[PDB]
Amino acid sequence: VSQPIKLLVGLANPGPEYAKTRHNAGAWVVEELARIHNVTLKNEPKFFGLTGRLLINSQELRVLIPTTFMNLSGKAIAALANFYQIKPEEIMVAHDELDLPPGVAKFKQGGGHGGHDGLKDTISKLGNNKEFYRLRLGIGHPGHKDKVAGYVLGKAPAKEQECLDAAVDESVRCLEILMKDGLTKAQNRLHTFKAE
Amino acid sequence: VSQPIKLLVGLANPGPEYAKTRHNAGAWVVEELARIHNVTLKNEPKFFGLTGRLLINSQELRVLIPTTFMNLSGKAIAALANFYQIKPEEIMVAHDELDLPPGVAKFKQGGGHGGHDGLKDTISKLGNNKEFYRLRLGIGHPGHKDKVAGYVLGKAPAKEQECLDAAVDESVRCLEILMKDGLTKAQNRLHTFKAE
């Protein structure tokens, strides 16, 4: 089946202290996808991150979790995409999404960064090309804008984390469906899911 | 001239709240100076951070810990410095310094960002001006470029943290000395210090 995605990126800050923070939600998806496919990601300094190649339905999907600062995610994504000759429209970036609630996830093509430091850098390093795909993992949002960075760098409370974990798992399933049945069918499934 | 400083900024990421990570070293200095001087740091959304005002030897010293993403620290700094008409040469930015070991600290004017995302943004948002002062709190350098973000976003081991905390204490004393006796004398004390 024809489907557009050659590279799946999961945005993150590195290390143990950031691993369970909301702003690492996209990495959670890639980690669970790789685990289910029995591939351990390898550190590749030239790509500023951890990478692997998955065989799913049995398309080849490269995956990446940058080990840069979140605000330098684009260095990883560009370095890898250039090496493998991948264009922005063939990249899906999974990330935490303030404008969706915990337990929801959506696919989208294009859009702004929404103030997400990793998406901002990604757009920049891909030559101001916004037309990469996104896997938007809802995290909710705080009451006040000035509290957004503290929010995304916090750990969700247990109940909220259950919703997020559910949406991660269903996003993984829909990525597997993307590789079997294509984007429209994957999206139709994902966009009816709501954990609660 | 000998006491140029009107604003002391302590860089840090604003979460997770559970975690004393190396890249928050500068905020530790501002928090301890504030504690000793009975200043409560208060959220001030128009400056994108926690703020205070001290009076030490009749010199007003405003303090800021940005609550932006680290790579937007200069947005907070410039917001406050513009509001109070403080020039860049009147600002001292306390920050983790890869180029000194744990237990050592130094004052300097100008210099590059050395890869520090907060310093980089600060130079930019101050109108591409490096000539603010720095309080460099040594955190050591991991010996390879690849995992620098992971290193600064890590928690120092308990022993190393004792060295850090000792450098924070000495840095607070030398900030007090700067406000009383001026920068040359404050340097003469700080630069001969090593934690024991």
From Swiss-Prot, chains A, B:
Instruction: List the residue(s) that the UniProt entry marks as the site Discriminates between blocked and unblocked aminoacyl-tRNA.
Output: N13
Record-level Gene Ontology MF annotations: peptidyl-tRNA hydrolase activity; tRNA binding
Report the active site residues.
Answer: H23
Lineage here is: Bacteria, Pseudomonadati, Pseudomonadota, Gammaproteobacteria, Vibrionales
Query: Do you know which HAMAP family this protein is assigned to?
Result: Pept_tRNA_hydro_bact (MF_00083)
Tell me which Gene Ontology terms the entry assigns under biological process: protein quality control for misfolded or incompletely synthesized proteins; rescue of stalled ribosome
Q: Which family does it belong to?
A: Belongs to the PTH family.
Query: GO cellular-component terms in the record?
Result: cytoplasm
Record bears the keyword Ribonucleoprotein: no
Localization (cell): Cytoplasm
Q: Which reaction does it catalyse?
A: an N-acyl-L-alpha-aminoacyl-tRNA + H2O = an N-acyl-L-amino acid + a tRNA + H(+)
Would you tell me the protein name for this molecule?
A: Peptidyl-tRNA hydrolase
